[PDB]
Every structure is written in C-alpha cells, then in structure tokens.
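In the previous chapter we treated chains in isolation. Here, by contrast, the input contains two separate entities that must be folded as one system, with a combined length of 1107 residues.
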Amino acid sequence: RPTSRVRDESDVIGKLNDMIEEQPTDIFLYVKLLKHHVSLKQWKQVYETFDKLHDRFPLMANIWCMRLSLEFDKMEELDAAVIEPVLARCLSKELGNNDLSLWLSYITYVRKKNDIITGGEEARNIVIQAFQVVVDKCAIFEPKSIQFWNEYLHFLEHWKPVNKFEEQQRVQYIRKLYKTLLCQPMDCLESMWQRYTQWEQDVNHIGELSAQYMNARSLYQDWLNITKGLKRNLPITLNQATESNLPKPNEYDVQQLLIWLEWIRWESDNKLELSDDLHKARMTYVYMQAAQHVCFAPEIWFNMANYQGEKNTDSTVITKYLKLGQQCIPNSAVLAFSLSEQYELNTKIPEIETTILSCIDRIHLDLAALMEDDPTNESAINQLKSKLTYVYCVYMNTMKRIQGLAASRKIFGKCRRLKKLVTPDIYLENAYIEYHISKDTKTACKVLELGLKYFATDGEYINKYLDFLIYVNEESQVKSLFESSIDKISDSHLLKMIFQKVIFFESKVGSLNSVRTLEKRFFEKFPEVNKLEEFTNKYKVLDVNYLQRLELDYM
Amino acid sequence: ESDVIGKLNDMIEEQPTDIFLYVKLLKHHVSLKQWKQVYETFDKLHDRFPLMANIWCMRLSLEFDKMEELDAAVIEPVLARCLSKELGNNDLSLWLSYITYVRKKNDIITGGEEARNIVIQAFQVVVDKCAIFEPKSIQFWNEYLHFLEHWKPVNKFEEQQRVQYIRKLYKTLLCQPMDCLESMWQRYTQWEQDVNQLTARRHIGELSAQYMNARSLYQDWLNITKGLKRNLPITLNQATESNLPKPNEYDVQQLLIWLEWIRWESDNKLELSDDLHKARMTYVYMQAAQHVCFAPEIWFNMANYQGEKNTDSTVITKYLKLGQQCIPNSAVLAFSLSEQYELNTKIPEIETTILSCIDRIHLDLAALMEDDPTNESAINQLKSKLTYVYCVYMNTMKRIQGLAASRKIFGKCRRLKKLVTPDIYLENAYIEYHISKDTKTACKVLELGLKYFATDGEYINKYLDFLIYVNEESQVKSLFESSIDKISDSHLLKMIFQKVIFFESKVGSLNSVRTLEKRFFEKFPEVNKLEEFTNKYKVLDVNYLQRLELDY
C-alpha cells in the first residue's frame, strides 16, 4: 500500500518515512531516519522520530540509551532541559526501565551535573546515592554486572576523606559495597573476594560472608551453564546500530528464546532464598531483559504478562504487558486473543472487537505485501491465508457468543467478500455454528454450498464438508456431494480417503447392496487398492480398525 | 485319568484345529491296530480340513504300507473322495500317490494293452491338472519320463506312439517355468537327433522360443519365491510338533511371499487362455491355503478370486466356509460370510456364523484367563476382540432385525460385566440415540456402563465425547465433576480437562472457563500455561495458534 504508488522523488526522508509506515516495528528503519536527521542537524525531527519509537517500544532500554548518548555527545552542552525530561520518562514508575547500560548512562549524567570538587558535601554525597539506587534496582540482579561494581568501587576508594566523620563513612560504605556484591552470582566474585580480603586487613568477620560467597560462586556456575550461548548485542549508540544487530519485523532466534525461558525458570526456584519482594524483583528484572532481547517472541510477553498478574490484584496488570507485547508484534494471534480475553474479564466489551480486528488488519497487509514482493512463493502465501482465516474464525466465534448470531453473520458476510484470499475453514466454522442454533440444517447447509463456489476442487474441503453432512446425519446430502465431485476433486490420495468415508457411511445406513456397488466403482478408479485392507476400514467401530490391530496386525 | 486316547480326544476337543494332536491320536490307534478308529480320526480331519492335501497323503501312505494288501475297497473310496470335483485336491505329492496306486493295480506285464495304456492316462492327468502349473515339479516330470523311455515297443504301431508321446512330453514341459529347464533341454536336444537327426534342427527351433521365455520366467518366480517354505509332512511318522501349524499360527513372511507369487500369476505372463490362466491361479491359491491355512487373508482372497469369476452365488461362500473351518475364531471370515449369506438372502445363518465366532472367542478367552492369568495384556487384547465382534454383531442385527434385537444382544453383554470392554456401551449408546435423536434412553446406557468403568479414563473420555457430540451441557459438568478423582492415570485425566475446558468456552461463560482453568493448573502444576492456552483455541480439530505462530 504505501511505497507502491506513494512514489516520492528521491529524498531519503520520504521513502524511509514510507517504509517505516509499512513496517513500524523494523527498528533499524527508524535508526536510518535518525542518522539522517542528525547529520542535517534537524534536531526537532530527531526527537519526533525517537518518540514514535519510544511510544511503540517503551521498554527497549537500549533505544533510550542511543538517545541519552546523542545528547551527551554535544560536549559542554549537556542541556538539563532536554536530558532530564527524557530520563524522567524512561526511568518512571510504570514503563520504568531497568537495564544496566541505561543506568550507567543515568550515572554518567548525575556525575557530570554534581562535581565532586565544587559541590563538596551533597556533591559526592548525591553521586553515592545515585550509585546506590542502581545497586538496589538492578546491579544485584544482573550477573554480568561486574563492570559496574568496579565503577562504583573506584569512586569510593579514589576518595580522600577531608576529616574523620568521613574517614569513617568511606569505609562504612566501601564495606557495605563489598559485602553486598559478594553475596550474588557474578562473573567476578573470585577476584572480588581476593580483593576484599586484603582490603579488610589493611584497615584493621570474613567467616560469616565466606558462606554466601561460596554459595554464590557456584550458583553462578549453574547460571553460566543455563546461559552458555546467551546473546546480548543490542546497540546502545546510534552509530553502532547495524541491520544485523537489530531484529527485523517478527524475527527472533528460537534457540535464544529458549535460553531465556530457561534462565527465568531457574530464577523462579528462588535458589537465593530472597524475601517475597526481593524474589518478585529478581524475576521482574530477568523478564524485562528477555522482553528486550527477543522482543518479537509472543511467548515471552505472554509469560511475563501472566507472571506479573499472578501476583496481587489490579485487574489492569496482565493487560498492561500483553499490550506492550502486542505493540512489538502487531500481528500476533497469541497476543490478540490473550488481550481479547483480558478485556472481557475487566469487562470492556468494545476493546474486544478493537484489538482482534487490528491483528487482522496487520495480517491483511502482511498478506498483501507478500502476494506482491514474491507471488511465486505459494506456500508462504497459503501459510498466511491460513493465519488470516484462522483469526477470522476465532473472531466470528468470539463475536457470536459475545454479541448474538447477527454479529457472526456480519463477519462471515465480509469473509465471503474476500473470496479466494481466505481459506475453506471459515465456511466450515460458520456452518458448524449456523447449525448449533436450533440443531437445524437448513441455513447451516446453504453456507458450505456457497463455499463450494471457490473450493469445489479442494478435496481437503470436500472431505471436511462430508464429515459435516455425515456428522449432522443428512443421508441424501452425502450421495449428492460425493457424486458431484469424484472427477472435480484434484489429487488422488485425498479422493480415495473420501470414498472410504462415504462407503463406510453407506454401510452404517443400510443396503449392503449399495455398498456392493460403491465398492465396485471405488476399485475401478483405484485398481491396485488392497481389497482386504479396504475391507477392514469398512468395519472400524469407533474410529478404530480392530480387524487390523487384532488379526491383520501385519497390515 | 491316564489313558492317552482320552486326554488326546479331550485336548483335541479344546483345540480342534491343532493338527498335530490328531496325528498323535492316530499314531496311537495305529500302533494298537484299531483300524476302525484310525478312519474315524482321519475323517474328522478330512471333515474339517478338506483341502489339506498332505493329510490325504499321510492316509493313502498308511494303506500302501500294508504291502500285498493294496485293498481297492479301502483305497479307491479315499481317492474318489479326495480327488472329486468340488473339494478336489490338486497337489503334486498327492498325485504321486495316486499314480503309485494306479501303477500297482495296472501291471505293465500281464495287462499289456490297456495296461501301460492306462498308466500313461494317469500320468497325463497329473500333467494337465497340476504338473504344468507347479515349477518345483521336476521330480514328477522325471518319473513320467523314465516310464516312457524304459518302454520297448512290441511292434511299430507302438514304436511310433512311444516317440509321439516322448515328444508331446518334452514339448509340454519345456514351455513352463521350472527348476530344471536347462538340463531338460540339453536332454531333449540329443533325444531328437538319435531319433531322426535330419529334423532335430527344424523342430527344436520352434520350441527354442518358449523354452527361453520360460527359462527366464522361472527366474522371476525363483526370486519372488526365494524363501518359500513347503515342508508339511506327508507320512504319519514325519509329523512333528514343529512342521504342523499350531492353531491360528502362520509365518507372516510366508503369507507375504505367497500373496506375491499369486500377484505375479495374475499378471498372466504366460499368456494362457482364460481357462488355462484361471486354473494356474486356482492351483497356486490351493497351494497357499495349505501352507498358511490359518491366515484368514489367503482364504479371504482365494474366496473373492473364485467369486470374481462368473455366476453361482455360492462359490464365494464355499471358500469362506472352508477358511472359517481352519480358523473358527476369525472375525475377518465370519463377517465375510455373514455378508454373503445376506446377499444370497439366507438371513438365519447370518446370526449363526457370527455367533460361533463369538463362542470360539469366548472359549479362547476363558482358556487364557486360566492357563496364565498374569498376562493381563494378552487378556485385554482378547476381551477387546470379544467385544469388538459383539458390537459388530449388535449393529448387524440392528439393521437386519429391528432395535429390539440390539437390545437382546446388549442385554447379554451386560450379563458379562467386566469380561467385555467399554466399547459396547458406547456403541450401544450411539445407536440407542439415532433412533429418534433422543438422549433419554441413549444416555441411561453409559450410566450403567459407569458401574464397571468409572475408573477407565479411556471410557470417560469417550463418554464425554458423546455428551459433547449430542450437546448436553449439564451432563458434561456432572460427569466431569464425579470422576476427576476416580479416574486413574493422569495423561488421561489431563486430556479430559482440556476437553471440558474447550467445551466450556464454546458454550459461553468465559468466567466459568476462568475457573476450570484455575483448578486445572492446580492439579497439574508444571503444565505449560501457553501450550494449553492454544488448545482452547482450536478451530476444526486443529490448533492453528501452534502450526502458524508458535511452530517451535
């Protein structure tokens, strides 16, 4: 739709803004548009662009990073009028990001705005506070956090106390630091212990700690193994963004998604033994780390969602997280339905139709986009057509029991309108509900008939159609359809499967003389067919062929 | 007690298809020379197994070993019965017995004319009836040969007919697939020369065409056969427990080799006329019904082959019947028969035949439940065969003789309790339903069923499926409730929650779903919250949320 016909000249800013509109989740495309506006120093558009990105991906910590970075690089112009409102938004209470790289940014700023020199008291006394919150909110939950612990450390050591009420607090802190770090699974405990030992001597216990340090040192071994191949390579600067280290729409390494679910599973055991708030934290941390690095996996959002709602009340929590998940994957049926389901519970009936509907809109456009970028890939297309229809079916059903039969009609009315773009399952699924009204076959039957308009050649359809006629016992009906399509049904392996069905049906419904004939026609169009193997199918009782499992178990 | 004749006549009554037991009872009456009992015993074997050609052999043999006493009063009526028209046996080992007799009762010396002239006729019928259909026939072709060669013509009207015959012989043999065509040609060449080598060439040319054709047709045969086994004993003393099939036994490998050889034959590579090919077939079919006699498939197929031919509504039935006599407990053959009796409209045997199959299975079950009741699998495997036939019997009688009939039957299945399987209440239920799509009656049935199967998840699962099918909301809640504890296993109970949950969804509420869903994950912690979320959203027995999005 856009791109095609919306043909601009040859001004990057226009095709990009067009391609982005077609793939609003391709993070890289925005990165290119930014790179461009920054090179033309059109700073106003840089923020419009960063904001559309923040709007859609609130918890993509690294995108906030790329942004704070951009400012910091203006040297002496670390403008607190631009900088603070950003941090303020991305470090908030709800869509509050908790990632180390971003905190290391938060710190750098706090350190450039409170000079240890001319500030004195609250100066070096605020930087400490800033280093502490990063320690409580995230440093103690991240095993690959060493780099930070060092940062905080060096700032405490390289500090000369002016008197003695300081000389003291400096060790009071240098202690509370070391102790804190040494009790968590980390990539540098071994060395960091060797350091604290020596430290304590040349200053004036270690037995107590020694315990949790051991426990830690090895809990980091299990970690290191569960992780093993964990990839965490998102760019945190604009220039480091490469097509290769940002996910393309709907992309994501399964291997990775599995390593993450695994780490999360481990965490949920609570091997550390933390209180209920400290463990709820430690998981929430890991969960947001995963939603950042495999953001396009609908299962990580699905799971994080339920983990946060599994907690306490507030009917809004579960919906909050699916919503964010749907924003990263606008085309996910997993997420659409999960939302659709929550809206129904907190009873907001209007959004139920809204959300599902969008997912369809997104899929519609994805289908269209492929039918044109390479219409020769008839599988990838049917795969989509299938997904389109599947969603329609779930929609129709869901509308039918939420807003009367007349609703379902509306929907199916328009699926028809789509023709061959949809798949047979919509008429079958419509049929089966158009029936269940008042067990009547008058209306319900007229449906599939229509369908025959586009699918009288899909043995796949016909089969499922007979299965219905047979199901809702309508004898004549079967004979009719069977007849009409023995030539018109492509394939063979599927037509065969269709004969056996109607023959088995004939048998159950009297005659045996009728059977005797269909049986003749069958073997003519299918010479070579094993007379006795097909004999057994005619006598399956309860979908099971016992003749074969008991006597001819060699068949 | 401890008198062989009694335990044997007992065991035999328990396994009337165990051919070895009759052979023992016979070895016994023979060593006591109670000849009148030997015949009664042989005849019971003949009654049940008409075409076990090799049993007629053991019996003719027995007589021939009474030396001078080749009593044509005993012998002839035997041959006459086992070489007749309908149950006429066509096996080469039996014909070699028939010739042996015909040679002892028509001496070449004192008979002269019709003497060696009747012996030839006998050799000739063995040639037209079977010798030319059997490729491992070499042994016979030799016999006939030596009898023609070792014959010096008294004059010249003989000198001639002798080579007229030795010709007609060699010609006939070299034209069919055989285990010694190579050597038999080498022989026929030299023969034509030392008889008129002025035309050894101009003749041998013609034959040389089909001789080749055969020499290679025998090569395919030899390949398809390769591992064929044909070792039945043809004398009473060669019968060992190991070379006679135990009741219902039969190498599958063998049955396949036979069906294969029969397919080959049906292609008609030989190019024979329509009666000559129909014979060649019938020969091989009878060979197969002798060596894998307890395989219902061979009898089944032989049967339809002989019917597929022309008219005579009784042909297919004749053969199914002999096969059922070999395997009284065959559901395949009982229904095949039951079906035939129905076409030739003799409704009364429809019930008879199915019923005996049942009797035999009942007896089979009983006997296993006793000889080794620890083998609970082999037991249920049977209780399932018992019930399966009952169901088919019940359905069959339902449309053949009214609903009241199905009742009678199911009424006696109940009488059986746990000896039968759950499928009978399910099957009865689905019919008791289809009367007038009413659920009052059809439902009271499965309830009964609950008496013995309230613990079989397998049953409860299938029960629900029905409740759901014939949409009866509450009913599903009730059953679901009542058995979440009483249902053994887990893998089955889990499958049961899912089902009832997917049902709850389809039938409004979603707040009800919300709850069941809760109880589910409690009794089943560890269950993948998202995997079970997809199942609830299947559309047409298919979980697309999984095949399309979460396809890993």
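Chain B touches chain A through 48 residues (CB under 8 Å). The longest helix of chain B spans residues 376-401. Compare these points with the single-chain example from earlier in the chapter.
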